[PDB]
Each structure stands twice: as C-alpha cells, then as structure tokens.
Design a protein around this ligand. Structure first.
Ligand SMILES: C[C@H](O)CP(=O)(O)O
Ligand SMILES: C[C@H](O)CP(=O)(O)O
Ligand SMILES: C[C@H](O)CP(=O)(O)O
Ligand SMILES: C[C@H](O)CP(=O)(O)O
Ligand SMILES: [Fe+2]
Ligand SMILES: [Fe+2]
Ligand SMILES: [Fe+2]
Ligand SMILES: [Fe+2]
Lengths: 178, 178, 174, 174
C-alpha cells in the first residue's frame, strides 16, 4: 500500500507538473516529508489526509493507491469444498466476482424480502428443489418458478428476492455475482 | 441495424464537422445517398463498404452500429432446463457471459487437450465426480485434482484443459465464462 | 474488414459452442457458407445480414468487427497547417476531435446553443475575447489565454464579446 | 472521504456476506469498531490499515473510497489567464492536464526525451517553429498552427527549430 502509494503519488505529482515544494505548500507539510512519502514512508497517512492529498492533486484516493493485488497461481486460484451462504472461490484479480451456493430454507414466498439491487450482474442456477423468484418493484413484482436445472440472469441494480416454491421444503441454487 | 447505423452515422459525421457532400465525396456516392443512409436506408451496405465508411470517418464499424440489444424482461432473462456442453442462459445485455454445464466423459488425463486461452475470466464448480485440471504451458502445465464442490477461477487468456480424474469414470462441472 | 470479421466470427462461434452447422441452421445458410465467411469471404454481407449473424450469436456487430486500425507513424501523427478548421485526428483515438474555431459573430444576444456533446470538451481562447454561455444560462467573458472545460452533455454557445468583431478558440473534444 | 468510505465499506461487506463480527475477527478488531467505520468514523485509519481492510475484503483501497468529486459549475470550470503554464483541470476528468509550454531551447542537437506518458497527448504549435523528436528518432519540423498526436508510452522531445530562439506549444494530455 505504501510502496504503491509512493509510486502513484510521484506519477501524479509529475503529471500535474508540481515539484515537492509546490505539493507540500498545499498540504501543510515540508517538501522533505512529501519526498519521504514518495520513498515509501506514507504508511501512517490517515484516510482524511489521503482525501486531501487526492483533492489537491485533482484526483481520487483510488488513483493514488495500488490495485487489489494478485493472489493467483499462474492465472488460477482454487478453493476446496432462512438462508445459508456457502462462499465459493474469490480473487483480487476480479473483485466483483462473488460466487455462492445458497441453501434456501424458507418455502413461503410471502417471506421473500427484496434487495435494493446489486452493483454487478448475477447469474443463477437451481441445483436442487424449486425456486420461487421475484424481481423488480417490490410492491408489484415479476415472478417465475424456477425448477432444478433452470438458469437465470439478473441485470445490475434490479432488485430481487426468492424462497423455495410454496410448501416444497427447501431449495439450493448457485449464484454468481460478476 | 439500419436505424442504429442511421443515428450513429449522423452523430459521427456531425462530430467530425462534415456535411453530406463532404462525406459523399470520400465514398464515391452522392450526398443524397448519404442522406438516405441517415434516413435508415443503409440496410444493404456491405461489410466492405462499412469498413470504408468507418475508415473515412476515422473510426470503427463498431462505433457506427448499435449495441447487441435488450432481450430482458424487466432486467432478467430465464431459461428452463468426450465432452457434452449444455448451454445455460445467455443475454445480449452481457454478451461475454457464457454459462455451461459440462459433462466430462473421458477419465484419462492424457486426453486433456489444451485451449489457447479465453477472452474473459472463467469460474468453475464441480457438480459431480472429480476433475483433473491442467492449465498454463501445455508442454509443462500446472495440475490440480478438483473434487465435487471445489470451485476454481481461471484468468483471461490462461490456457487450460481437463478430464475426470484417472479411472473415475465421468465428472460434471458448471463453467461460467464472463 | 473481411479478415477481421472472419477471425472474430470464428472466435465468437467457438465461444458459444457452435460448430459451422449449428450456426448455419439458425441463419438458414449452409455450413459451407459459414466456413467461407471464416475464410475471409464475408466481404459482401449486408448490414442487415450482419445484424442477423450478431443476433444469433447474442452479441453486437461491433463485437464481430475489427478496431479502427492504426494510422500512426511510430506512435505519432502530425498535421501541417463559425468556421471549423479541423486539426489532427487519429483512428487510435476516434473520439479526439480537435478544432480551431473561427467565431465570426459578436452579438451575444444572439448566440445559438449546441445541446451538449457525448464526451468532454477542452477549450482555449486563441484570439480576441469570447462570450460563453452554458447550462437563464451561466455566462462568462473569456479573454485570450483563458481556458475552459465543458462536461459531456452540457449545452453551450459561444460568441465573440459584444462588438469586438471576431475571435478564435481551440476546441478539443475527447 | 470518511463518509464515502463508510458507505462503500458497508456495500462491499454486504457484497461478500460478512456481518460486522465476521469482518472484525479477520482484522483483529471488535465488531463495534467496524460498525463505527460504517458510521463515518473511519477518518483516522492509516494507509496501511486501509490496505488490510481492502485485502480481507478481496478488493482495492480505491474500490472502498469515493470518486474524485465535483468541482464544476453546472458542468463547467474556467480558468482566466521549458516553462509549464498549467491550464484548467477538473476532478471530473483527472487525466486531463492541458498546458501552455514555453520552449526556451533552440538547439535540437540537444533535446532531451520524456520516456513516454501514460495516456495520449494532443499538441498545437502556438508560436514559433518546433523541432519534434520521437520513437535514431523520427523527427519533424512543425510551423505555427501545426498539430500533433502522441500515443501513450511514446517517448518524445521538443526544441524550438535550430536557432529560432524560442517557441510555444499547447499540450493537452488526456
Ligand atoms: C440477501 C439478499 O436479500 C438477497 P442476495 O444478496 O442473495 O441477492
Ligand atoms: C474445449 C476446449 O478445449 C475447452 P473450453 O472451451 O471449455 O474451455
Ligand atoms: C466549440 C464549440 O464547442 C463547438 P460546438 O459545440 O458548438 O460544435
Ligand atoms: C509536451 C511535452 O509532451 C511535455 P513533456 O512530455 O516533455 O512533459
Ligand atoms: Fe442477488
Ligand atoms: Fe475454458
Ligand atoms: Fe462543443
Ligand atoms: Fe509529453
């Protein structure tokens, strides 16, 4: 984080044609301190201070910090084996990827509590049982009965909810947010 | 396609400050014909001709044609239920999404024929049996044994191959390219 | 175009697990015809036909066609020297449209609005003084040397300052 | 920053099915502390600590922090008027760095190279004549009014034409 910030900070400062002294003057620091940050010593900078640094450099904290990181072994990562979520493999190389095996333990559609929508698309596959899906306007939603083997796609932000089909006991589906 | 091209063409032409006559002069057409295209009559234009139109407008055919389209019902789309691929739900709103249930009928790892890699990331989940996965350099690859319930992530372009574990008969996995 | 399409078609087809025959039936074509397109023989396909091919493959025409192309000389392109005088453009950055605009009207009371662009815009006052209007509009009198940024979709108009005759701006859309 | 982080933290946490206690244990914090961060009280978290929070949540610090912000006035920002004279910039388009460069060296034999930028660059010769070098370099003598495009990462240098004293360019990085 500190090494990444060090590199990114120096890139942005040079990009806006500021020297150490110029940047220091806008941040209540000495140019020696800014030089220190560009040397990896920014580790203890606060979120608040980071916001100010991003601001004077006309950018975001995100632009001054390193990407999530690489946790892959030559391109891949493997994970061994009302609602219980069994989280599947995730990776910093694709942060929005959140795959899950969901056991649905309520078979009363009236218990379907709607989301407000997701950032990111979602793919679903019914592994066991039958699912009663609802989506859209929670006040008056669309509905579908998804039997085992059915597959579904839910676009970003579309609110949804589901339970197992009425009186069918329980259902299991795999849900992949990407 | 014609209506979309009509709108996009007129947008680009105006964006580069060209009038009908100017654009027509670069394409061996009359300005009336270009006006016609911007009126939805470009339907019979050839791929070759489209390439030339994109070229003189300093852009790509893609920039002059409409996006894939919307096949969703209020945000969602549902599909009812050596290798056999059972294609799951797809959508033009997320073209790169290609989910599959793969039945692996060869349990001889020596039969694993490597890919050359995918455009797009890939999430996998072993539904049945045990999978013998290989990835990377086909000449000397990485390998892992994925039992039922295991989940895996393969980064874009990483070549891979798989069969069921030696002498285990057959395996089944769900593979989601996104 | 034909060769780029041949490569992208094959890739997409393989991507959706379709063999020549599978794709051909959906289009009402023979499998040899599809093989021919992937052999670079798709040059005469019409826009409408491309739309059908993209549709059955669940994608766009753009996803099956090559990028703009490269017109740079080792990464560079140069151009030697209301009236629009178009500056250098490149297929490597299509949305870049730099211009030298001659503003020949100096009656702000009669400026006309450009309902907004798709894309941001950077401007620099080359000569004279400009009277800019945007967004009961927001306004600004801008002397030579002044610079400005206009966000995508923001409507705006320009005129030379009241009775100053004319002015020049550099406008860079990107 | 604190409020943006509070919102993004909660969203990401919910996204990975973690309740306050689940996230707190991984960080060696109490669940009340996490609740406090989502209550906008994360202002004093250090860069290193943010790195740990992002790590356990399998994302980047950037994904948990707000966008640059808005400094426009109804979509517009203006700026009234080798030496770099910085023109208008905006947090709504951070990579836009327009400049008026005073080229005070007129000995091409002694130009020095900028090993390439991250991002494209558009240039326009304001005054005098420029001697550009890029990429045994490629070269070009550019009179006033000439314009040019330099693709990302392409090394380049500028000097006024041999013995012409000085020149001025407008360089727009985007
Ligand atoms: C829990 C929420 O109500 C449903 P999810 O997050 O699985 O989409
Ligand atoms: C068939 C190829 O060899 C493997 P896939 O396309 O499932 O990744
Ligand atoms: C400079 C101006 O932005 C040119 P217009 O938008 O009116 O085409
Ligand atoms: C105009 C030039 O591109 C400025 P530099 O790249 O040398 O910083
Ligand atoms: Fe969901
Ligand atoms: Fe694959
Ligand atoms: Fe404009
Ligand atoms: Fe440069």
């Amino acid at each position: 984080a500190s090494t990444g910030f060090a590199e990114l900070l120096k890139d942005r400062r040079e990009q806006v044609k500021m020297d150490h002294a110029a940047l220091a003057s806008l941040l209540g620091e000495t140019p020696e301190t800014v030089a220190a940050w560009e040397n990896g010593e920014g580790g203890e900078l606060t979120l608040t201070q980071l916001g100010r640094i991003a601001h004077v450099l006309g950018t975001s904290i995100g632009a001054l910090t390193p990407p999530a990181g690489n946790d892959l072994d030559d391109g891949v990562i493997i994970q061994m084996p009302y609602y219980v979520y069994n989280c599947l493999v995730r990776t910093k190389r694709a942060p929005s990827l959140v795959p899950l095996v969901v056991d649905v333990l309520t078979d009363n559609p009236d218990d379907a509590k709607f989301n407000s929508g997701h950032a990111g698309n979602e793919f679903l596959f019914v592994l066991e049982g039958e699912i009663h899906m609802k989506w859209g306007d929670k006040e008056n939603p669309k509905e579908a009965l998804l039997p085992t083997g059915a597959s579904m796609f839910v676009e970003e932000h579309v609110p949804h909810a589901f339970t197992a089909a009425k009186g069918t006991g329980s259902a299991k589906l795999i849900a992949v947010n990407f």
